[PDB]
């Protein structure tokens, strides 16, 4: 993955790459979140939303999709997503 992301000049993908390799050893390393981040790194967003909605990552999808300031669709997502914390 590093060789492929280095052969062509890319900065965000390689950043996600060292984040993934640092997070692999400790945390559970769920492939759904990283697949969705890879999908959302391009312009196509809806399939990334579907991917995060697939297994269980509603809250992370909400916090991910807030950063780009169109809060209406974030509310649309949070109407279905729950917050199992306390």
């Amino acid at each position: 993955a590093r060789k492929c992301y280095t052969r062509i000049k890319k900065l965000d993908f390689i950043y996600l790459l060292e984040k993934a390799e640092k997070d692999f050893k400790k945390n559970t390393f769920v492939e759904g979140f990283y697949q969705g981040e890879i999908y959302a790194l391009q312009t196509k967003f809806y399939e990334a939303e579907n991917a995060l909605t697939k297994s269980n990552l509603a809250s992370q999808a909400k916090e991910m999709w807030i950063i780009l300031k169109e809060f209406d669709k974030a509310m649309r997502i949070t109407d279905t997503g729950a917050s199992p914390i306390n």
């Binding site: 280095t6 967003f45 950063i67 780009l68 169109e70």
Partner: protein, 133 residues
């Protein structure tokens, strides 16, 4: 853009709403060390990667590392190396060069610089792999 302020720029550019105009507005906003205008322009342009870039940027302390990371983000690295050099703290430049994937420059920088053996051997092995492939 060059004579008037930022808010009326945003107001007069919202009507046209073109990719090139938004891009140039964002470049001007970031060149003046302004992030609110830059993040607004990227949000209007519907670019997620640039928003991730800015989010990574905003957690910085010094006034010069932000400049260097932005300018090496755009397309150009030599001025970033020079600003690292004037700021000193060279291992930052070495890390930037090694993550960018250019190994010959890393080998040239390491030679006669510190004399540490391990990273020189690793860089030479990586450069040999790069030449073999």
């Amino acid at each position: 853009l060059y004579k008037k302020s930022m808010q009326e720029m945003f107001i007069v550019i919202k009507q046209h709403d073109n990719d090139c105009l938004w891009r140039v507005y964002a470049k001007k906003a970031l060149e003046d060390n302004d992030f609110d205008s830059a993040e607004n322009a990227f949000v209007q342009c519907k670019d997620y990667a640039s928003l991730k870039f800015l989010q990574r940027v905003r957690e910085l302390d010094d006034r010069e590392r932000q400049r260097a990371e932005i300018q090496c983000y755009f397309n150009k690295v030599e001025e970033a190396e020079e600003i690292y050099n004037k700021i000193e703290r060279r291992d930052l430049s070495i890390q930037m060069r090694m993550k960018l994937g250019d190994w010959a420059q890393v080998v040239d920088q390491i030679r006669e610089g510190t004399g540490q053996d391990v990273e020189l051997q690793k860089a030479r092995l990586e450069l040999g792999n790069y030449y073999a492939e």
